[PDB]
Write a protein that binds this ligand. Structure first.
Ligand SMILES: NC(=O)c1cc(OC2CCNCC2)ccn1
Length: 104
């Protein structure tokens, strides 16, 4: 309900300020990341999710979690599990999955 979206605000704020958030704060600039345009067919990042959440672009917490899990699916698609970005994506994905279950 109304709490459906105040939930997402808590988690997105906590993800935005997380230590391991840096690879996901703003969209990937494909000019600087070769191959990213070819490989990732639906880029997503925390700032895009913030924009959408601010303008009411989510009708439920489900669609919010869809965008979050898309951030981490793209991360694992593009980065090796032992790359620096990959390690941060695993730390972030486990955080998100945890906090998400601590409400639902
Ligand atoms: N969130 C991401 O997927 C992501 C990928 C990325 O690619 C870079 C990673 C470092 N070496 C060159 C390519 C850089 C930042 N972030």
């Amino acid at each position: 309900m109304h709490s459906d979206l105040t939930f997402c605000e808590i988690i997105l704020m906590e993800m935005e300020s997380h230590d391991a958030a840096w690879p996901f704060l703003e969209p990937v600039n494909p000019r600087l990341v070769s191959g990213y345009r070819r490989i990732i067919k639906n880029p997503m990042d925390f700032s895009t999710m913030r924009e959408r959440l601010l303008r009411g672009g989510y009708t439920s917490s489900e669609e919010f979690a869809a965008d979050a899990l898309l951030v981490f699916d793209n991360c694992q698609t593009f980065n090796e599990d032992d790359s620096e970005v990959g390690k941060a994506g695993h730390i972030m994905r486990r955080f998100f999955e945890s906090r998400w279950e601590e409400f639902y």
